[PDB]
Amino acid sequence: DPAKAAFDSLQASATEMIGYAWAMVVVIVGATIGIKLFKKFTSK
Amino acid sequence: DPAKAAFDSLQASATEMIGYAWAMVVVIVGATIGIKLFKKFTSK
Amino acid sequence: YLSDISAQLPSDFVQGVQLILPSNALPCFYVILSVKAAIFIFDVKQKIVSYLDWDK
Amino acid sequence: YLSDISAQLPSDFVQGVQLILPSNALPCFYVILSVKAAIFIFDVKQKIVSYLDWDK
Amino acid sequence: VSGLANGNGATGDFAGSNSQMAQVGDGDNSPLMNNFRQYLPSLPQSVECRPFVFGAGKPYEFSIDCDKINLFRGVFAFLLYVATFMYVFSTFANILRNK
Amino acid sequence: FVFGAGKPYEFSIDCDKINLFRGVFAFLLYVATFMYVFSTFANILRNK
């Protein structure tokens, strides 16, 4: 099966990328929640 | 390599355009933050 | 308190503000700051006229 | 009341906050908490000077 | 009654309230409003700006740079000072207007 | 929560990334009560 080999490679690659993404989202969501708190403390 | 030459040209061009864009965004973001301050000072 | 929490607008975000600002913008802001003062003098002076009821 | 409703920020949402925070951020917050205290002492002390009208 | 406000003290029948009026406080420091300060949420501090790297080692490696983040921290400082000056001010003016 | 029990298209919203939300959500509820208890003691003589 020359197709099985190929399909397996692409799944492996995809899994790696989702890992890097779950990192980036926690850095950005952190920042957003941090701007929203400070602004609140400042303005009634 | 008749392809290397071409790929290099297109990257050069892209870099130039990103420069012009970083300019335009600072003019527009300036304006937006300036409308939002003045409106606030005016209405409780 | 207001001396060490001080910051100024960066110099790149000027070209923006000076493309959108009308002529009556800053003049208006100053009014909102003068109306405040006036009300504080009215309040203090209204409480000195109420001390005339302490001698009865 | 404030002892059992207590929670702390998870440790993953730090790298974020420490990329966006200016220098005058936390210093400002403390001011908003000191202005409060001051007004509470003014209020209590202003009500002790009004007891001077109970002897008339 | 003048000494329980000046902070000079009271001697007589008003000699019990000289310990109740020490808990109130004087100036910015109030023993009553400093009880609330052992229970303050712990917020992180401020450090210099470090980049974030997506995809260490792989062909698809990029980095959110600090040069365009340092500009945001500049505008963000300003918009926090403006919003405190307009709070300190407006609370002095309405000191007799029972908020 | 499992979408599509038994079929080729079976997936599950996992708990590992939901437990992190409950962590941030707790914090943002304590901060919003401390800033209420506090501010109601300070303005006890200011007739709200």
Residue numbers in the entry:
A (entry chain eee), B (entry chain iii): 5 to 48
C (entry chain EEE), D (entry chain AAA): 57 to 112
E (entry chain FFF): 306 to 404
F (entry chain GGG): 357 to 404
Task: Quote the original article.
Most extensively studied in this group are the F-specific filamentous phages (Ffs) that include viruses f1, fd and M13. Ffs are also strikingly simple—their single-stranded DNA genome encodes just 11 proteins, of which 5 form the phage capsid. pVIII is the major capsid protein that forms the filamentous body of the phage.
The pointy tip is comprised of proteins pIII and pVI, present in 5 copies each. pIII is the largest and most structurally complex capsid protein. In our map, the N1-N2 domains and the glycine linkers are not visible, but density is seen for residues 257–404 of the C domain (accounting for the entire C domain minus the final two residues). The pIII C domain is comprised of several α-helices of differing lengths. Two β-strands form a hairpin loop which extends over the exterior of the main filamentous part of the virion; reminiscent of sepals protecting a flower bud (box 1 within Fig. 3a). We observed two cysteine residues (354 and 371) at the start and finish of the β-hairpin loop, in close enough proximity to form an intrachain disulphide bond. The C-terminus of pIII is buried in the centre of the tip, where the 5 symmetry copies come together to form a distinct stricture in the virion lumen (box 2 within Fig. 3a). Five copies of each of the proteins are intertwined and arranged symmetrically to form the pointy tip. pIII makes 12 hydrogen bonds and 1 salt bridge with its two neighbouring pVI molecules. The outer surface of pVI (which is pIII-facing) is hydrophobic with two distinct rings of positive charge. pIII forms a negatively charged scaffold around it, with hydrophobic interactions being shielded at the centre of the assembled phage. Fatty acids were modelled into the map according to their size, suggesting one molecule of octanoic acid (C8) at the tip, followed by one molecule of butanoic acid (C4) and then 5 symmetry-related molecules of dodecanoic acid (C12) in the third site. Accessibility of lipids to detergent could explain the change in phage stability; in this case explaining why sarkosyl (with the larger head group compared to SDS) only affects the stability of the mutants with the largest truncations.
